[PDB]
Amino acid sequence: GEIEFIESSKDAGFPVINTPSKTKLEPSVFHQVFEGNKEPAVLRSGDPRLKANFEEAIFSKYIGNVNTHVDEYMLEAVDHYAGQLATLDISTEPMKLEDAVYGTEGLEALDLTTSAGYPYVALGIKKRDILSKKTKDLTKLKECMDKYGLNLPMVTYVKDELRSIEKVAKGKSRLIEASSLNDSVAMRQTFGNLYKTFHLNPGVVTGSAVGCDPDLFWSKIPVMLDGHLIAFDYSGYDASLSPVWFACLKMLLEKLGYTHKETNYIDYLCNSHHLYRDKHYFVRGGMPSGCSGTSIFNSMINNIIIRTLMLKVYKGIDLDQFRMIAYGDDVIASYPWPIDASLLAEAGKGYGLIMTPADKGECFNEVTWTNATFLKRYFRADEQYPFLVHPVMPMKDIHESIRWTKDPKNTQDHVRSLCLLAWHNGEHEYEEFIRKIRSVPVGRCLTLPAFSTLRRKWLDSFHHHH
Ligand SMILES: N#Cc1cc([N+](=O)[O-])ccc1Oc1ccc(Cl)cc1Oc1ccc([N+](=O)[O-])cc1C#N
């Protein structure tokens, strides 16, 4: 992706979008009790922890674009994947507006707490002013959609989350785009049925894990990925995608029965118009992390990308024995024969991607189940039920999360979330975590699930159908 134009909002008539510039993250009541190195991302140029220039830092993920047409390797990749997806039977029929906006099986309602984006943010209007969960009303939305239309600017917020010292220092906070509610809703109509299928069918046919539940899905993964594991990181995936990849997605969607008009929306995503604070800018390429369906479309493209890289390097390759699962940029894959990931990474470089060893990592080492991670979790067969696998978030990551909070009022909810993660590290490690929690008085005011209970509920979770 590449920033093509930057002027001041002022000179084009847009008002200053006024995002909040102080973090919502404050030290929790457990900040002393546990150790960690992470802190709130930098949100403004003044922040005294900066050791570089914020404005430059945040936009620097737009590394450039490789000008190219869709080559022979892309085509066979698109075909093959298109092949897998055909088996799923995806309605290209639009989705009943009420379903797109307020829920249905395999697609949560629109989130009413997130931004409605332009122009509503300028005009003081929020989603709850336009939509009601209680009344499923659509008359107002319908006014707003017709009043204001589609293809509106996006609003660029700086993500307010924990980062490492290095990322705080370098100022490399992630950006998220808010799509105008109108566009959020259009897209959910156009592609709602697609989203629905991928959420309801995570794994090897979709090549996607978006929507999944690790407590349940982990146990399927080694079954679907029986070969020699392949896995790697990207640096700045979303922003590194050149237009050619969007082109491939377009094709892929057309083979699915979407028509040219139905695919204009990808150009919305690819060639984007953005508002940030007091500046206004266009971008050619890059996925705008946060708009409708961006994880799905990232995943889809990643399935096209990897296949493309295997083809261009391993000319004799048989893709029908390849298997991958993506969550946006996070991949785990397998083939029955060993594969040199570094070869792919240098193939990738040529298409403008920056692929790196799985986890931060010295070399593209061999990946085992011992060392494999996906969505930041490890895999560990249950000692007693070997066909069940535990998703194991590192307590390092759990410790970091519990030491902060955006709202102490949810402390209980927060800690029970972390409890559902922690017990996969096993009973000693759980009980110790609970001791430390209970070493402050708030600890003891919380209803916390017992190890034994989490275990039983997990085991019984495999009993009832799906
Ligand atoms: N793609 C996928 C995806 C993955 C994540 N994810 O990181 O898990 C978050 C959003 C994603 O798109 C959708 C995913 C799930 C559902 Cl149920 C709907 C999705 O489409 C959207 C719809 C509405 C809004 N909204 O403005 O409220 C945003 C999106 C997007 N963003």
Author numbering: 1 to 466
Give verbatim excerpts from the published study on this entry.
The genome is replicated via a negative-sense RNA intermediate by 3Dpol, the viral RNA-dependent RNA polymerase (RdRP). For this, 3Dpol uses the viral protein 3B, in this context usually termed VPg (viral protein genome-linked), as a primer. Crystal structures have been reported of 3Dpol of the enteroviruses CVB3, PV, EV71, HRV1B, HRV14, and HRV16, and of the aphthovirus FMDV. These enzymes adopt a classical right hand architecture, with fingers, palm and thumb subdomains providing the correct geometrical arrangement of substrate molecules and metal ions at the polymerase active site for catalysis. Given its critical role in genome replication, 3Dpol is regarded as an attractive target for antiviral drugs.
